[PDB]
Design a protein around this ligand. Structure first.
Ligand SMILES: CO[C@@H]1[C@H](N(C)C(=O)c2ccccc2)C[C@H]2O[C@]1(C)n1c3ccccc3c3c4c(c5c6ccccc6n2c5c31)C(=O)NC4
Length: 342
């Protein structure tokens, strides 16, 4: 039982070895990430004299073909001149090495989930959250470039990395599972916590599903907990409704999976199917954010930049991101014009 001459394990993953030299160029330091696609390695590039992250794709057609699509999107994105591209992780180059496709990315620092973990899931300031909010909106404006029209499709704290551990600059990484506007190919998409209503109801969707994700992420960044932490899709929708109420009838009348979560009563209105929740719309975002009670858990009482006014602008922006209708849900260009960023 030997795989690819001893270089691979039984999952077609490359057996990583610390200190290994590739092509008299890359000095492999250690394994820093792992996934179904394969592995991510820290390394030093002798030619450019810089630390890089090498994503080593499994030696398997399924995963190689997926990675070739990633490479297309990244190169497509990195070609565009506009400065909005410096919120996407840079793909420096790619190559084949002992039958594994290898993507060389710039090396970034911690991810926003690490950040939350350090606070013991109590969150970061509204002032830091604003900075992240603006940069993420700018990155979405970029993905909305008509010639790109890219749906990241899986936005979450662990996919948003800091450039430098002492600055607020962030970049979105991992477009491996990244949809693109067009004919619908997929329906089970996004990570559950950040999955939009249109996806849950099996409806048409577009770039607006990333905006939904962002709304959930920003609240999470300031409280430290996920806004909608569903253990399954029923739980997920039920938690969304707690805060936002029953979705509008005109959406549910069209929703193919409306009946997974709701029933249409004889009077024509929609209610939740019974399955431990607060009534629709009664777990108010106002109170989740602690608008008038000194922020979440009162921990921001007396910190500057956390007044009622400051919280009202943030709350308003968030609600416009969590619009049930993806046609009127706020768009990136308008997000950046909001009072919360002035
Ligand atoms: C996005 O981070 C992933 C890894 N997660 C976030 C996890 O394993 C986590 C899952 C759940 C909860 C917490 C972490 C961290 C690590 O490897 C992963 C696979 N990666 C990928 C995957 C796909 C494309 C690009 C990357 C990168 C990249 C980097 C990266 C990392 C840098 C430093 C430490 C860890 C680390 N990682 C990185 C990573 C990177 O610097 N550039 C691209």
């Amino acid at each position: 039982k030997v795989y690819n001459d001893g270089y691979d394990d039984d999952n077609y993953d490359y057996i990583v070895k610390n200190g290994e030299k590739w092509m008299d160029r890359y000095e492999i330091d250690s394994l820093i990430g792992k996934g179904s696609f394969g592995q991510v390695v820290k390394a030093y590039d002798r030619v450019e004299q810089e630390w890089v992250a090498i994503k080593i794709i499994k030696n398997k057609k399924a995963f190689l073909n997926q990675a070739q699509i990633e490479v297309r999107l990244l190169e497509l994105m990195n070609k565009h001149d506009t400065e909005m591209k410096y919120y996407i992780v840079h793909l420096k180059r790619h190559f084949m090495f002992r039958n594994h496709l290898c993507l060389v990315f710039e090396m970034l620092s911690y991810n926003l989930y690490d950040l939350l973990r350090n606070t013991n899931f109590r969150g970061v300031s509204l002032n830091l959250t604003r900075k992240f909010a603006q940069q993420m909106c700018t990155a979405l404006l970029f993905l909305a470039t008509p010639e790109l029209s890219i749906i990241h499709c899986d936005l979450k704290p662990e996919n948003i990395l800091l450039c430098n551990p002492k600055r607020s600059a962030i970049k979105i990484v991992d477009f491996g599972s990244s949809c693109q506007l067009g004919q619908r190919i997929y329906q089970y998409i996004q990570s559950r916590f950040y999955r939009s209503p249109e996806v849950l109801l099996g409806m048409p969707y577009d770039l607006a599903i990333d905006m939904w994700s962002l709304g959930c992420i920003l609240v999470e960044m300031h409280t430290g907990e996920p806004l909608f932490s569903g253990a399954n899709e029923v739980d997920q929708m039920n938690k969304i409704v707690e805060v936002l109420g029953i979705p509008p009838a005109h959406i549910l009348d069209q929703a193919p999976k409306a009946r997974k979560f709701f029933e249409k009563l004889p009077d024509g209105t929609w209610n939740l199917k019974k399955t431990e929740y607060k009534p629709p719309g009664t777990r108010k975002l106002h109170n989740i954010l602690g608008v008038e009670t000194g922020g979440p858990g009162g921990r921001r009482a007396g910190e500057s930049g956390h007044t009622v006014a400051d919280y009202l602008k943030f709350k308003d922006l968030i609600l416009r991101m969590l619009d049930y209708d993806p046609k009127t849900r706020i768009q990136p260009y308008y997000a950046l014009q909001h009072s919360f960023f002035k």
